[PDB]
Design a protein around this ligand. Structure first.
Ligand code: HEM
Ligand code: HEM
Ligand SMILES: Cc1cc(N)nc2cc(-c3cccc(CN)c3)c(F)cc12
Ligand SMILES: Cc1cc(N)nc2cc(-c3cccc(CN)c3)c(F)cc12
Ligand SMILES: C[C@H](O)[C@H](O)[C@H]1CNc2nc(N)[nH]c(=O)c2N1
Ligand SMILES: C[C@H](O)[C@H](O)[C@H]1CNc2nc(N)[nH]c(=O)c2N1
Ligand SMILES: [Cl-]
Ligand SMILES: [Cl-]
Ligand SMILES: [Gd]
Ligand SMILES: [Gd]
Ligand SMILES: [Gd]
Ligand SMILES: [Zn+2]
Lengths: 401, 401
């Protein structure tokens, strides 16, 4: 009943007993595995009882007076109002658990160290903007990055929703040409057009920081320029390839995802931006080298005088490694927190072992934990993993249009 | 019907073939186990009926006289004997389909070009040896490798199985050492001990080719030395790192897997070794760099004068790329067929497109199709896939000891 899980580097065997608690049924059946797919009224009370029960076991307080009392108050609150409010500490505990439950996050060794900014008393896009700005400056911290999440008000029936329209707080512009093709980041062509179609004055640049389209309930979104001194960026140079700097590449310091939905105890927060720090392969391999992103691989290989005429020279692999070297070196020189994929996966192995003792397993998504370069050189490659949904959780959600 | 997206391009397709998946995999709606390495006449009849229907579809004769006649003939033979026998052309079609259906094979663009040797009249382990040597000779073809399978007699009531105890026809010994380390290939410690127990006089190099342990029905395994001239090998050198040759590394030309079970229409062939040609990352990344295989990564990085004291220099990634370069250059120099992971994954994308037109889908195991270095530099990384089990099929089976 409990999956046997083997590590093939060492020979060790464990059992994921935690998988027996999974809630939101995933996309797979005995007939066919869909693990590789990117995107797979008083029921509220059931998810609240369960989450409150999680909270008190976490503090060695199950079956104690305050546990009993908190069970009644949510029951009463839902009876009268239909929803309920989370206590401050519960929201902190829920936010950390949702991070701890994220199967595709390799950074979860850090799950206990998270700063939670309670923004549930917010109203209008001007208040949101200041909350976001406090987050960015606290999280950036002059390059000594600190994980943070800002929780805006929980969705309620019969009223609109708080939503940040950008997928991240810092994203670069994507503009077309006299030929369809894109200047800048092609991942952000849609939101770049929704920003121009809302007043913004588009630049002419490859690396123009987009403006925040912030949406207060039942009102049209409102643009906001970000303070340039708040958006910390790292110009990219290579330790030994002097021409690399002249390619003019940059990335931003803070990875801050602003389009996911935080779900705690049956409550839903469609605006709950969280941020950590980058793993270098996210920048160097995916954002810069993906054929549908900045797609720079051949340009670097030409500069390195590599033989791009046959794939068996492994010129793609050689250029990719040096791009990743330049990311790590640039961020370190600028004193901005960054982690390489070897360090990160080794810490995730430690996380798996910790979570085995603490909870009897850990939901992990193999295809996302294994880095996009040098996969079998990291320990997670050789580790079998079980993927399943626990709550609280971060969820994907439709765009607000 | 699962919707499947390619993220590099935007293409969208539905896998209608997956609904035909008969035998069941390890995943459920609760939990995905896709990353696990290892996931009555009436039922024999209903598998055979499905294979016969496949065969007569492929020759454009479904529902024809010959088709119904073959169905009745098979039912009659299962009634009289508890089994049935494949016609030669059914066996050929069956072996090709099994390759076509193999979810973890990136080489399936080639599935129609397969030489099938019918050894179903094989009588002893000695004859079995002669068929195997002829296989190795034909498939190696002096370095211009050809894909081939040899099919030994099917499992049948009243007799034991033919088995090849070796996991591949060509494998290097692994000797447990004085201090408890391993000399040679650690993956082969078990089979190396079995060979010695059965009368083999061991060597003590790191690249000693193992004998074959061949089992005839109801017989102990019998040892056979492969003739030196039949095992083509490739000394490994690097095009620009001249000290690399002094590592003394070698690999063999022919990947010939010999411990899998071939299942066709309910019949099982526990001995049916098959062979193709190597993709360079199997040798360079996995066989040479895996910590639990030859584990040469750190020795190579040190020789390259890389900084091995910090992970962020990416010494592992740089050393691995050069090991793969060495493999490709060495095999091309020796004029032995080999494919790099970029060419192989590009041909697999064409296979997926062929198969979507032909059958409405294609079973594929993303975590095995994506190469173990430079994953997102290949197009298969950005392609969603559906994993399921079709028959005819190659299956894992337990070791005979
Ligand atoms: C502290 C350093 C962190 C690192 C190094 C890290 C690393 C990563 C990486 C590499 C991914 C893969 C995303 C992709 O490649 O598209 C990811 C996903 C994710 N991260 Fe982390 N992250 C960090 C912090 C955080 C924090 C603070 C949170 C939440 C409070 C978080 C929640 C998530 C979630 C929800 C996902 C998507 C996972 C899923 O769908 O299951 N991460 N992370
Ligand atoms: C002609 C060139 C071929 C190439 C380049 C190729 C490539 C590969 C690779 C890279 C793997 C994964 C092995 C690993 O990393 O552990 C694999 C697995 C496999 N291959 Fe191929 N192969 C070829 C020919 C063949 C042939 C001729 C057959 C059978 C007729 C075959 C059947 C299989 C099977 C059964 C597996 C295990 C897959 C599974 O468990 O679903 N391959 N192949
Ligand atoms: C917080 C954080 C840090 C980091 N270093 N990386 C992160 C990546 C994502 C992410 C999750 C799903 C999809 C995508 C885009 N493919 C990104 C994310 F939400 C948060 C991340
Ligand atoms: C035919 C063929 C060619 C090749 N070039 N490679 C092959 C690799 C395997 C294989 C299957 C399961 C596990 C392993 C070891 N990871 C290898 C296999 F069966 C056949 C292969
Ligand atoms: C198709 C495939 O599932 C998709 O490209 C996934 C694979 N693994 C990934 N892993 C990470 N960390 N991030 C990603 O965006 C993806 N993309
Ligand atoms: C546990 C993990 O799934 C395992 O190490 C797999 C991953 N993908 C693989 N892919 C290929 N082609 N070959 C392998 O041996 C493996 N090993
Ligand atoms: Cl990003
Ligand atoms: Cl091999
Ligand atoms: Gd030059
Ligand atoms: Gd040299
Ligand atoms: Gd040495
Ligand atoms: Zn699955």
């Amino acid at each position: 009943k409990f999956p046997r899980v083997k590590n093939w580097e060492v020979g060790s065997i464990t059992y994921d007993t935690l998988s027996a608690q999974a809630q939101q049924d995933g996309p797979c059946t005995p007939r066919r595995c869909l693990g590789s797919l990117v995107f797979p009224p008083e029921q509220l009370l059931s998810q609240a009882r369960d989450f409150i029960n999680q909270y008190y076991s976490s503090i060695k307080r199950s079956g104690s007076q305050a546990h009993e009392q908190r069970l009644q108050e949510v029951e009463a609150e839902v009876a009268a109002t239909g929803t309920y409010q989370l206590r401050e500490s519960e929201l902190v505990f829920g936010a950390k658990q949702a991070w701890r439950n994220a199967p595709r996050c390799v950074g979860r060794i850090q799950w206990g160290k998270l700063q939670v900014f309670d923004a549930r008393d917010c109203r209008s896009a001007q208040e949101m903007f200041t909350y976001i700005c406090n987050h960015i400056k606290y999280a950036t911290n002059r390059g000594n990055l600190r994980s943070a999440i800002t929780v805006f008000p929980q969705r309620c029936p019969g009223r609109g929703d708080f939503r940040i329209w950008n997928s991240q707080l810092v994203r670069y512009a994507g503009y077309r040409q006299q030929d369809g093709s894109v200047r800048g980041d092609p991942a952000n062509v849609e939101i770049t057009e929704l920003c121009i179609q809302h007043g913004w004055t588009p630049g002419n640049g490859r690396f123009d920081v987009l403006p925040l389209l912030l949406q207060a309930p039942d009102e049209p979104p409102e643009l906001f320029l970000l303070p340039p001194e708040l958006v910390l960026e790292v110009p990219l140079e290579h330790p030994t390839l002097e021409w690399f700097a002249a390619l003019g590449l940059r990335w931003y310091a803070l990875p801050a995802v602003s389009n996911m939905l935080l779900e705690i105890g049956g409550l839903e927060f469609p605006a709950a931006p969280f941020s950590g720090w980058y793993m270098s392969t996210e920048i160097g391999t995916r954002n810069l080298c993906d054929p549908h992103r900045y797609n720079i691989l051949e340009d670097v290989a030409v500069c390195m005088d590599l033989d791009t005429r046959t794939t068996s020279s492994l010129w793609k692999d050689k250029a990719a490694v040096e791009i990743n070297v330049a990311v790590l070196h640039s961020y370190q020189l600028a004193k901005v927190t960054i982690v390489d994929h070897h360090a990160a996966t080794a810490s995730f192995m430690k996380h798996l072992e910790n979570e085995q003792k603490a909870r009897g397993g850990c939901p992990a998504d193999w295809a996302w934990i294994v880095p996009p370069i040098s996969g079998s050189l990291t320990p997670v490659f050789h580790q079998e993993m079980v993927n399943y949904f626990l709550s609280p959780a971060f969820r994907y959600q439709p765009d607000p249009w």
